[PDB]
Amino acid sequence: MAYHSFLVEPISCHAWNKDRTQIAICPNNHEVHIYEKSGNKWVQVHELKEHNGQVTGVDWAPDSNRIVTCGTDRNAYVWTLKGRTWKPTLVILRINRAARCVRWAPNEKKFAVGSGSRVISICYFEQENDWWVCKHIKKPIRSTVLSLDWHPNSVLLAAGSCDFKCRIFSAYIKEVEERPAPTPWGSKMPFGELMFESSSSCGWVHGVCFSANGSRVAWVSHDSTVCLADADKKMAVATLASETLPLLAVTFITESSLVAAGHDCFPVLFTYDSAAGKLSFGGRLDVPAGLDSLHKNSVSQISVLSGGKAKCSQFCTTGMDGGMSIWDVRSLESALKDLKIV
């Protein structure tokens, strides 16, 4: 509904701060531009120039107000605001291929970087040598990691890779956190332990997402399918094949309602029926260049702006068209009298 163009080229990735008062985007560059809203206008306030290759992921730790980025230059940088300038701190990831994605753990004590080195770098800060160090989750990743998403417990981590699998690992780092409480996903969670692995053997997994309480993980694959597995039904997996193009990003908006977007260029709704254990198409959310959708190219990222993944009231999409859209769930519900969430 509410569309804004920051540029005509792709917005590789984005991240909002705690207040959603500012958004950082990568304008298909080596840099990150931060925009702040003033009235009904967007004003550029910062420029993070440090990566020596295209930025692929961006995540903003809310409380600590720390932005983390990763790029094809094989590096990752943690940005801290010192007065009126963001300063970067290099992080050695020990990878020999491009970084692809990165997400701060909910507890902000560590972040995870997925890379083409066929591994996930778990990074945390050691305040005894003043530097970020990392541990690698290797097995059984056989290809590049496209996306990551932490479980609300800051320990389990969902990951999608080009080996067609959606997995859940333990990213438990004893030096910064306490041993995790049990979860339906399993009781044993030593670092790198594989908690779950999808069975399908086709389609790159572009996006992965945990539900608000974390008992459900959903991912979208290139073979135009969406999936959801919940630890409460013994990890049963519901699967839905679409009639349209591949989805590239997905997020829960309630415990049983997903919103995704991809190469069709518009957001759609998916709902899950716990009893039946089946997923169902909920409809196109952007109903009316040469296209009848807000975005004029592939939507590659979506994120909740408010209400959390438990009762989302507004979400955001950024795409290869350079646009950023803000969707209001409540409005979408009025505009579409036959829409059904949860």
Binding site: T72, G116, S143, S300
Partner: protein, 166 residues
């Protein structure tokens, strides 16, 4: 009567195949290569498909995570058509740098080949690129018939001008 259906199948197949995204090389440090060309990571290559009008006219579409190769087998009803097509395709390939989505050489067994990468689908509406390939297929068929007539039309005036001077 068989063209419209043929181009509709080819169109749907391109739309499905032209779903690309930037992919840094997982094989070579800090490289970025069209995967359908280097084919060094089998899991990144999609299944090759074909759409044939008949035993002669057909299109081969090869997709991967960041690139798509498209090869067209043009209609050539006779010798003069064959050499005309070969000259035009050669004419365009020599100019492949201005035709940024054209391949300098076609895949063995085809007359002309395209290589559409994620960079193309980034700065050009993919539905517009799909349109172009379909437009291209039709238009080259027409231009070839216009060339064929020209040669014949001019051949006649040339034979008459000479003969009528005796």
């Amino acid at each position: 009567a068989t063209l419209r259906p043929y181009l509709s199948a080819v169109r749907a197949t391109l739309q499905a195949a032209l779903c690309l995204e930037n992919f840094s090389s997982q094989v070579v440090e800090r490289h970025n290569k069209p995967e359908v060309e280097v084919r060094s990571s089998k899991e990144l290559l999609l299944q090759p498909v074909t759409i044939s009008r008949n035993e002669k006219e057909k299109v081969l579409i090869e997709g991967s995570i960041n690139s798509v190769r498209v090869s067209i087998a043009v209609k050539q009803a006779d010798e003069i058509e064959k050499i005309l097509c070969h000259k035009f395709m050669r004419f365009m390939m020599m100019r492949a740098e201005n035709f940024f989505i054209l391949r300098r050489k076609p895949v063995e067994g085809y007359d002309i080949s395209f290589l559409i990468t994620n960079f193309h689908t980034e700065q050009m509406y993919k539905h517009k690129l799909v349109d172009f390939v379909i437009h291209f297929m039709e238009e080259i068929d027409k231009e070839i018939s216009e060339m064929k007539l020209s040669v014949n039309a001019r051949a006649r005036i040339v034979a008459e001008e000479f003969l009528k001077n005796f």
